[PDB]
Copies of this chain bind each other. A is one copy, B any other.
Amino acid sequence: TQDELKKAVGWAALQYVQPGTIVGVGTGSTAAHFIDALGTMKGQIEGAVSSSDASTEKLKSLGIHVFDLNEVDSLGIYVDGADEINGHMQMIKGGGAALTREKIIASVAEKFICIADASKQVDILGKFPLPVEVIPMARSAVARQLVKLGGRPEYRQGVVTDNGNVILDVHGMEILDPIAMENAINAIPGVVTVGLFANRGADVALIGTPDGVKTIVK
């Protein structure tokens, strides 16, 4: 979409920010717009928890205190995009650089507000390769199991996670039952995090469109 649609979406997410809470902040162009909006509410929030250095720097530029996750016991909401989101509000995330950090922050938030572009909406998750963070020594073992689960794992060359792990992007899966798939992959020894946000998906989806921001509630 255009920057204007993203801006509208980012600012629309501000309506989910409850005074006196700590806000979970995602990353990306739309998230950046939400941060600008959050700056106007710096007086009603205690602070924020950020999913990236980029977002952390911007939050600080607006005078918002950024907490380490271990310092908080709860987040009102977590506002972030996704690589894919289906009709059941389940998502695929992690195509970028911080899969694990994002899933952890999302687990602490009461509500996940997805601000992914309209192009991210799909019926069956899987077209976009599913990211799986893996302990380096277990790469081949996990890959073999991912093949048995019906996917084509591809080592993301030249990339390491902040946890020092590698990523296997799984291609060709038609994920009909995201929860069962998330559980199946989380069960593999060597897997740190899988990019399926299914057991804990989005609670609200704000989709930008030519006729305004569309709100989809779980």
Contacts and interface: CB of A to CB of B under 8 A. Distances in A.
Specify how many copies of this chain sit in the oligomer: 2
B101 A137 contact: yes
Q: How large is the interface on A (under 10, 10 to 19, 20 to 34, 35 or more residues)?
A: 20 to 34
Nearest to A145: B107
Interface stretch (A12-20, A28-36, A53-61, A182-190): A182-190
Interface in A88-133: 100-101, 103-104, 106-108
Nearest to A107: B189
Contact of A69 (B103, B106, B108, B138): B138
A218 interface: no
Contacts of A164: 163-164
A44 interface: no
Interface of A: 68-70, 72-73, 100-101, 103-104, 106-108, 135-141, 144-145, 163-164, 182-183, 186-190, 192-193, 199-200
